[PDB]
Amino acid sequence: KFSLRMFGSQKAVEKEQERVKTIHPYSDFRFYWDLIMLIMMVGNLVIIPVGITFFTEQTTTPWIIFNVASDTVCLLDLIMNFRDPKVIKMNYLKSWFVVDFISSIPVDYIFLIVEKGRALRIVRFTKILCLLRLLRLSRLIRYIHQWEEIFHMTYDLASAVVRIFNLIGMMLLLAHWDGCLQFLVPLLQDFPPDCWVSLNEMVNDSWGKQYSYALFKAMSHMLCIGYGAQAPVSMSDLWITMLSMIVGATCYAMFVGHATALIQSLDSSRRQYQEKYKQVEQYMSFHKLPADMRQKIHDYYEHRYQGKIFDEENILNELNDPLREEIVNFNCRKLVATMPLFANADPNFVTAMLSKLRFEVFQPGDYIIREGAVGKKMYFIQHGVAGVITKSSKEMKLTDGSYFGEICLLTKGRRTASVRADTYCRLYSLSVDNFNEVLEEYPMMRRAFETVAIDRLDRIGKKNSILLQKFQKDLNTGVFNNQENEILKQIVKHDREMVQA
Amino acid sequence: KFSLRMFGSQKAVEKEQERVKTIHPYSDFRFYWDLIMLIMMVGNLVIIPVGITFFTEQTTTPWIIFNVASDTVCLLDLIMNFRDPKVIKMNYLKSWFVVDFISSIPVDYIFLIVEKGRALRIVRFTKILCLLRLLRLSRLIRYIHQWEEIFHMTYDLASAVVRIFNLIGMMLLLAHWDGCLQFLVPLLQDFPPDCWVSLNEMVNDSWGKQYSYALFKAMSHMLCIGYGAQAPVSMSDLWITMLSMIVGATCYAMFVGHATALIQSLDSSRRQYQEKYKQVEQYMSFHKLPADMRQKIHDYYEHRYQGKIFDEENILNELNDPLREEIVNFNCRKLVATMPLFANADPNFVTAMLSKLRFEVFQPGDYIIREGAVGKKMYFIQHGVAGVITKSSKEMKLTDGSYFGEICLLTKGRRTASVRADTYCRLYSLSVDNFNEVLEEYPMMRRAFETVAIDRLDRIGKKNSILLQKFQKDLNTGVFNNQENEILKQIVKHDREMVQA
Amino acid sequence: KFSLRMFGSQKAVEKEQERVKTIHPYSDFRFYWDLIMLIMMVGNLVIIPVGITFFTEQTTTPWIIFNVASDTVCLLDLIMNFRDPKVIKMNYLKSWFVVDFISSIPVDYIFLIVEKGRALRIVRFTKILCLLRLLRLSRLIRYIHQWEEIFHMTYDLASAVVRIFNLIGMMLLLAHWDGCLQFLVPLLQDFPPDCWVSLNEMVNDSWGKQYSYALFKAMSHMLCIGYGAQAPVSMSDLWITMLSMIVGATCYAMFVGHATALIQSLDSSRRQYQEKYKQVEQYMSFHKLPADMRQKIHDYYEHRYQGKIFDEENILNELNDPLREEIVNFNCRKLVATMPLFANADPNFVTAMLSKLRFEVFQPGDYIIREGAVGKKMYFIQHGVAGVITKSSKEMKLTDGSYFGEICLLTKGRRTASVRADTYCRLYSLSVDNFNEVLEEYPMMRRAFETVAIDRLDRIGKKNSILLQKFQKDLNTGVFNNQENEILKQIVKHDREMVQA
Amino acid sequence: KFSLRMFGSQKAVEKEQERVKTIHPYSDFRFYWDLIMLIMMVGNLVIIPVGITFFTEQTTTPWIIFNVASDTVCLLDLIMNFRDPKVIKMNYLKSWFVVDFISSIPVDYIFLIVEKGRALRIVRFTKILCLLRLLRLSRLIRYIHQWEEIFHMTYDLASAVVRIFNLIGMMLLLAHWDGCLQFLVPLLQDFPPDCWVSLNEMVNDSWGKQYSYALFKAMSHMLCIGYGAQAPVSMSDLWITMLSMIVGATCYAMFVGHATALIQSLDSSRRQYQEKYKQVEQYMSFHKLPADMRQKIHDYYEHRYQGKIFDEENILNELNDPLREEIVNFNCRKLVATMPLFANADPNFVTAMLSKLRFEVFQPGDYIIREGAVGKKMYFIQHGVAGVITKSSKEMKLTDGSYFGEICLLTKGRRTASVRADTYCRLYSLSVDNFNEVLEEYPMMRRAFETVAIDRLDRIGKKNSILLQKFQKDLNTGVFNNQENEILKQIVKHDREMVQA
Ligand SMILES: Nc1ncnc2c1ncn2[C@@H]1O[C@@H]2COP(=O)(O)O[C@H]2[C@H]1O
Ligand SMILES: Nc1ncnc2c1ncn2[C@@H]1O[C@@H]2COP(=O)(O)O[C@H]2[C@H]1O
């Protein structure tokens, strides 16, 4: 799983496990018990303020048993954290384990022993010990970080407000702690003067009502909603309210920061697309191009990228050989399945040439190949129609699953015909050097291309002396296999039928 | 349109439509009816709290008819969403369609049937059913997202606060819902004790006044403006106010996040320009350059980029062949129209060479070409004046639509004269290898360049043996066309006249 | 200036001015009068709420004259904005000029004419007309944007809170408008019931006191500081307070957004440096390198970059030929001034080689050149000391302004000696291909390098057959100039003296 | 230290120190005394509001001595700041030193002298002078910035909220100043009417109580928690409360901005990783790949990068020669230590080849080398197992510390066998050109590779004519060293044993 990936492969993980055997943190038992320990810690942290407010006056079996269970869980956690191994345990104890173990203790037994050998003072001491027992927050945060690293990155694509709920729960816990403190401070001093407790007679009211009022001001101060009293009668109340206001301000600022971070991270793709389009349009405006140019460029950009951005060259370069090769194989399955030359050929040659193609998109009406120009690349029509024109020869059309541009790459001359796009056509270009290097060691493909090129040129009417001489030399050569000749004839017939259509 | 672009080309869209025919979401009927459905849903969501506040005591024809129309619209929407096709419909029903259909029901008929077979309880049940009928928020959000994807990206350049109005409307709707809840909660319990309703006697007041007060506290709590009561008398009022404060805090945080995201996205271009300029100035300060150097570099940067940034190389590389080629053709229309050699030549050659130019800008007084140095590029003066100097030959000037640097690229020797810039001159450079590869297969351009170079060198006085030998060989060669000779003579005369000026 | 740069060069600006002459926005008169117009508009916008509060009851000469001056300024601005030119003026009038001209009118004369042909109604109409006359905010914002584009980018490096003051002034103006509205609304209705005016008897108080109270609640509501009344007695007061709360919330959100944008833009350099260092340290941790490796890499990074970041290659590539060349010339002035070979040589050769150097920094103790290895570059010691060691030859030192690594680049063999760094040394590397291409056409530099190399090798003791044969061929060749021989002898003597030291 | 790095090397620092000697800011004495000066300034700024509130009525020895010490410290700081050197001192005095010196003066002596030659007026003047003496804030901020530049960047990796505490302290100081002003303003006017002082009788209360109330409203207004009075009775109180509200709003906005900046900077690595993964997945979705493809690509990305991002090529290119070389040497210590050919060879050759390796990772089951294809690179199995298969030869396995792909790179033919990955294998690839250029000048490595290749091919059964001819020529050649032959035989035996296993 995650531990195996972080360690190495299966062999490395097995070797590490054998070395450990001959208790480590990356163990299934610990990786399952940490959740139970965190749940127990959360329950204890939620119940301790309630017990402090209740002052343990009626700590009956339902509460005493819960406190004992929490203390036992904390003791077990400390014992597990205590455990080459002796030195590590000593270092952990000297660093942080001793403090956590001291914080994890059944203070109820200590209080009972002290009383066996000031009831309000005893209750205050017990409450202070219970509050100090909540020092497991560091371990809880470490476990939460481990869980986030192990599970939050497993999908990370639900598009849900989970982190928002995380800060919501954190703020709720902070507000609960603030209310507990603001209720215990009058209780710690027993509230002699007319503070809020005597102002609203909350002591004579139900415990739920007093908790509601305390939480009410806790939330009001922690939030930026000031429903607070004009002022306080006592002396320490002002200072604890400053403390509450400070922690609430910090919590609200962190809340706003997390919210804006999430908002910025949410709309990232739209942000980069808008940035790129404004960038290109602003560059185009720098040169003061006509508005028609602006519209045409915008149309091209909107039609090539479907409102999307990607460094296709960079991403394809990053990937390894088989993944990239098979991605290319899948992306052009229609091309390889349609054009008969690819099917009746070595698949090694097919993938070797396919690995060098490049995506291109052409607007309708735009000239692709002009007669008389110098040629530098092939063109495979992946999708869309195209037109081939030449004076005194009418015109013809090429559909999907075909190709052009082989004459100049073969004879090293100049472009003969002219090629236009009658629609938004998506083609695959192949550079002259890549084509030559792929085709040089595969003479069968060269012979087939020469034959189909001769057929097409005879269809047009012009005759290339170099291509004719090459064909004559090939015929005079020993490469005259009957099966190869039949395959070439079938390919030529299919190409002629497609060109006629 | 957008659906056609997302699907493919016209042929692909037609094939998909034929396959569907032989009800799909990308249909004009649905793409027009979704707006009406969303408008009806918004009207229902705005009217339901009003009816809940009114408790349906006077649900006369104007309100009963509106409720019936909303129920009919919801039923029609559910029926349309219900509809290979049977399996898809079953999956949609099992996933979300069943819940929406249950939420879209005329609960008034059910209430009437129940009463036919506790008036306050009946009113409360009707209000609860009406509130639950607002579960079409998911479909409304989906339609809003579809509309944003279809229309907000169509222009995306109005520089107007439209998203700001979006969150403003969202906050207004949230405040309306909060006020409806805060008014119905006393109504749900009938408000026995002295809550706010008995405190201000809002029941005896007009419905508009009570709505205003409820919305007043709803907005006060939803905002971070605490005008709330010191505290509440009842028990549930505190809890519902905690809920209101929480939702208001979340809404305000999201508002602030969206606002800062929009602010950051607004000033993006200035941000990147400032970052780039501070980057370059900080690098320059790292080497501890003199302040005069700082001023000169800042002037160059401010004059090359007109306070703008663009990866011209990257953007030009991304574009396809025809768009980039025609952009280059337009950007140098003055150059091709002015210099007589370009006009009386094959346009294929013109664009082939033009495709390889590079923009350059030179400060006044800066040396561009120094005598005796080794040359590596051409220079086409697109705009600005330049000076040509050489000892014992006075000096001359070159205006726009001219060029220099051909001697070294032709004879493969060293720079003869010296070239200075008397103003901020914008030139077009052409590398030696690109120039040689473009010019090698077009011997007419080479002959014309050789002739004009010989004329210029004779004007200076120095004679190049290699160039003279090449000219003599060309004269002895068979390329002695009368039209070509006349064109070369006219070009030489024009160049001499320009050099004299 | 800015207009000249935005238009072109001096010639282009002069041509545009001549074409205009044979009133344009890029004119000095308009570019100076816009500031006066904006000042007048600001004064009018600041004085209109004061007059509305005063209800024009005592509009004596000091106020009537100010109103007349503001009206005259607005009329002059409209007249100037009114003015090929007729069509442009008509289009501007149809678009926005007509609305501004209607808003810029002396409504006092219209009111006087109407009265010549309901005193409270007349005062209310005059106040409404004065408020509507403030529609010049669009022109004011356009002028402010023009000023920001013309002046804020002139320096943009004061590190002062100027934009912060901009939003502070905007918020102050918004608060003034809100207070004016909140004071005029009771005045518009004459405040029949016991609103705040009757609550505090502000009417009987001084005008300054009433303005202070109105501004007090305006600022309280516009800010997120709710000192507002528990509730309002009247009916429209609640609605106008909702409007005030909404505008204040929007203003505060925009304030926070601008503040965080400025904060993010302020610490940009530290942010990128921290990002880069965490990036490299995290990569290094990915490979699990020892802590000593971490410290050494951190030391190297902190010593090469002085806590700075810059794409030196990219920035140097962007710059043109003369700027980059002269920057390189200045950066190595110590090198060219110290080493005697550079001074007694063609400066063209000096800059040609200097243009290809690369900065490098080496830690103390790190081996730079190891004996027996294959060499690929030169090294120029710009600063710091270095040690040359070889078995059975003791060792020697090389100070600043020297070089090594020529033996392998000359004889195309293997490294002979070994080179160590005894301190943090900053050197300049020169690749073998660049060195060969620079030195091939400058045989004097090759001869000098060969002579000094022979001297150094004889100092070590080893003799290179290829170098000796080349020296013998050069001696037998015709390049035996007395001045060149004397210069070579002096350079060899200086190199020997430096090597001895 | 930091000054030495900012100046240069040890020699440069020593030269600068000698030049200064033959008082500069980069001195240890000043760099240690600045902290004491800042501590004294902070103490004075904390004590001045307390003395102003106390009105110096009981300025006994504990306070008079503290004031005298603060004045003496300020005078010493001004004297030190006062001190080629005369011109610098004059310029500093004309710029800022004079203002600071005027602000740093013992105003108590001036007041005593004035009284020797209106007790409330004298106290007010003394308080104003004490407030004006706090103008050392500029020097304090400069010292704080220097300390941040010298120490905060030393580690910058504690992951602690130190900047948060910085703004917390800044806000606390601002609140203290605001409370001091809000308490002195009634004291400045002596508070004639019933302001807050007469409202709560704070004058008759203890000084601590009055300070608590003043700080209470200072914090309430500075924060966005409005517990402020409904309104003020006096006239100037409203204006000073506007000032307090403005400064508090600015402080809170800056607090929020710093908080969100820190939040964004904290989660940077996760942000870029999420951006990159969403980018690649979105590109993959653009081509509409099957879900199995999505899962496989996600697995590959998660296994190559351990949830990490790094431009390994860029980072490795940035580093110098020795650091990069030794990093490569450490990263492949297992490879060099395991494979016997590396150990019994020149370490120069080992590092020369190691410098050109490239990391690669392959999924289980993916074909790496297919029979009949054209080869272009080597493969070194750093970790993981691999399988070698060929028809009619069963199959074999290759473990870690081995290599394949030498046949095609040697004979320049085609791949003979086939290679599969049976697990997640991490290999090191070496390009054909780099391998040839490294191996061409080290014929011993070529001979060893040829011998092991012949052994492996004979193990398979196929015989390469070119390799056999090369081996025969090498045997007939003079390279027949007994030690080299024994080493080759041992390497061949080890390779055969490994291949058998
Ligand atoms: N009638 C035709 N049938 C098939 N292919 C053609 C025809 N005319 C032109 N082509 C192809 O279109 C190409 C355009 O110009 P080229 O010189 O590249 O070589 C041409 C041929 O490959
Ligand atoms: N005694 C010496 N005096 C001057 N230069 C030397 C001496 N020894 C070595 N070098 C230089 O240091 C270089 C290190 O190895 P190279 O083979 O590059 O060639 C060497 C010489 O250029």
Author numbering:
A (entry chain B), B (entry chain C), C (entry chain D), D (entry chain A): 108 to 129, 135 to 195, 209 to 242, 252 to 635
The authors write:
Hyperpolarization and cyclic nucleotide (HCN) activated ion channels are critical for the automaticity of action potentials in pacemaking and rhythmic electrical circuits in the human body. Unlike most voltage-gated ion channels, the HCN and related plant ion channels activate upon membrane hyperpolarization. HCN channels are also regulated by cyclic nucleotides, which act via the CNBD and fine-tune the frequency of their pacemaking activity. Here, we present cryo-electron microscopy structures of human HCN1 corresponding to Closed, Open, and a putative Intermediate state.
To investigate the role of these cysteines further, we solved the structure of the HCN1-F186C-S264C-C309A mutant in the presence of Hg2+ and an identical LMNG:lipid:CHS ratio to a global resolution of 3.6 Å. Based on the position of the S4 and S5 helices, we classify this as the Intermediate-state structure. Mutation of C309 to alanine results in an intermediate state with closed pore supporting the notion that—at least structurally—this bond is stabilizing the Open-state structure. A comparison of the voltage-sensing domains in the three HCN channel structures reveals that in the Intermediate state, the R4 charge of the S4 helix moves past the Cα position of the charge transfer center F186 by a quarter helical turn. While the resolution at the intracellular end of the S4 helix in the Intermediate state precludes definitive assignment of secondary structure, the weaker density at the C-terminal end suggests that it may be on the pathway to unraveling. In both the Closed and Intermediate structures, the diameters of the pore gate are below 1.0 Å, too small to allow passage of ions. While the Intermediate structure shows a marginal increase in the diameter of the cavity and narrowing of the gate and selectivity filter, there is no noticeable rotation of the S6 transmembrane helices. Strikingly, in the Intermediate and Open-state structures, the intracellular helix–turn–helix region between I284 and V296 becomes unwound, suggesting that voltage-sensor activation destabilizes this gating interface. Interestingly, we observe far fewer lipid densities in this Intermediate structure, with only 1–2 prominent densities at the S5–S6 interface than in the Closed state. Finally, it is worth noting that in both Open and Intermediate structures, we observe only weak densities corresponding to the N-terminal HCN domain, suggesting that interactions with this domain and the S4 helix or CNBD are weakened upon activation.
